[PDB]
Amino acid sequence: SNSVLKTLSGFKDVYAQMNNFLQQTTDESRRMLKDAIVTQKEVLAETAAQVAGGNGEDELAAAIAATSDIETRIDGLWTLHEGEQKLRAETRADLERLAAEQAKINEEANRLQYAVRKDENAAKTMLRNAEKLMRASRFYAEFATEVSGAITVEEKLKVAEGHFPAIGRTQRDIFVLLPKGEKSLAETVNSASGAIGALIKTPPGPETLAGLSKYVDRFRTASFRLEAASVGKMREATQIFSELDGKIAGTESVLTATRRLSTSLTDIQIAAAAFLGTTSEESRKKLLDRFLAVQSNLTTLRGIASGMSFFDQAAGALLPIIDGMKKDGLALVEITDKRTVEFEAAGAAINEIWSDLTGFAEQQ
């Protein structure tokens, strides 16, 4: 009796160990449980001293048989867990690989965005300048019209005043854009503010209207010249656009496709996380979709960016990874399922044995 106590108590050493080898699956966990077992089939052997029923009746046969059976499966249950962890380690490693690639992809998208903007800006500038001169043309014209339309010097001076700020504004806006071949035009735009200003401050007098009329006429001349200069810039803008437009269109198409790809790469990282954190076939197939999505994006890019080195390298890095992961994911789903079922039955075995051995003690 004090020996059945010994067995039941020694068995509890096994129960614990096994639970640890299953809750956890440390290597020491295993050894611990394997030692607990050998010493238990020792203790359970000394109990074998007592005999009652022999072949006709022997429950403890069941336990010693069990204990022997379970001990055989320990190492295989460890390689199962040890193998599942290796697949999960690799999945994490490959997601780091993909993240690294997505980074280069993003750097490239940025490069491409910059390159578009730079090219799109050549004509933008040309057209900004075209408008400057056309605003100057339009201004000088408004001045000549409204001043020369004023009858008295009082109102001619009034009108000039209203427009006097714009005269310097216009000069600063167009100074650098001024055709260097022209020289009187230069004189007009720069001298204008001082002259007209002075006339405004100076009290109505002899020749104040002469001077006004002179600049009303220098402005009309300038207006037509600046209009021509503007159309000069416009013609430029159209040549330079037309000659970059292909390049730009082509890059916006690549850059769009790059952003698309980078997005699907992030969709992988998300789906993979769900997979790793709930490793069913369900999550596997969701992750598989995200994979095919990246595969599309890459073939799409492959057409517009065939020969674009970065894309060649990106596909060279990406696709072998995805291929490995598609298979690795299947493997992991499987090993994970085996691990859980075997770890289930294993625990079941450690409960049939307790049930059985509680038995003998019930029998006393």
Next chain:
Amino acid sequence: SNSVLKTLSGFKDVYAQMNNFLQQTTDESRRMLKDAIVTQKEVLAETAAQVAGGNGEDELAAAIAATSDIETRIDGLWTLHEGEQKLRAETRADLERLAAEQAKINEEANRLQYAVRKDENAAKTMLRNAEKLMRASRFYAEFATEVSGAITVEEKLKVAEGHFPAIGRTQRDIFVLLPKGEKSLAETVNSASGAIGALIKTPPGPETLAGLSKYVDRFRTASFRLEAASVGKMREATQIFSELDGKIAGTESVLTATRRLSTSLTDIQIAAAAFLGTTSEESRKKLLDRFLAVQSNLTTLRGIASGMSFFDQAAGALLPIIDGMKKDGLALVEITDKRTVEFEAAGAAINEIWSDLTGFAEQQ
């Protein structure tokens, strides 16, 4: 003696339970261990029957004292774990909240990208058409020059042939762009391919050169008209650009800032994951950086997009989340540290007691 066996064996029931309440921290785990304890201080009480040394000498005092002490801490160690899990649940919940917002942010960035392109395309089209007419102008001119420069009908026909494909190409390219006010111009561009073609096929004859000379002259006229039309389109392009350029610049600035923000939102999701998966103060402070980065991005956007509803709502949703999480993260670091230390000492207590109680058995 058979009672010390009872205690040591009953204690092993406790050892296991406790380990489960610590490896795991299920509610049933707790109850299990709390039941294992009450019955152990029962069994350890019957052993109290034996007395040896009394106050002068009593190790089992140590165990029964222990067992009493540990039992008191169980529930507090559970609320510690129960509280740590609540913080981790909320962290995950708030990351879902942020992800949801990042989505709206991305939809908006897309909206804005579309809106730029649409606006940037008004002038692009105008300039594409401007170049079409200027290519047509240039073509008709090349034809008049090279044909009319040819002396004999043989080479006049030769030259026309070379240029004959372009005549229809040009017609299709510019047809819709043709100023409807003009009517002879219409006649020339459309009639051209047929007439010139016919002249080419028809064998050199009387009036073949007359007909050529007629179209050489209709082409020069058309050339100057198309050049004017082109400059018409150009002028349009410059007005329409200049009148959208502010809108476009402003949107590219918002869209850039939106993409920037969305990026920092992803940086949070990453840092948070590292935090959750290694919940040290170190990872907390890294996540804190990602938070401040988002906070910047939002104030930046707040200036360019002040009044942009979507941004008002985004900041209204984002910032309270980040605030909660900054504090929640501190809390979690703390509770997590307490949990681990207390769960450590708890296990230590279940080892001093085994050491002590192994003792009495050593004493026998």
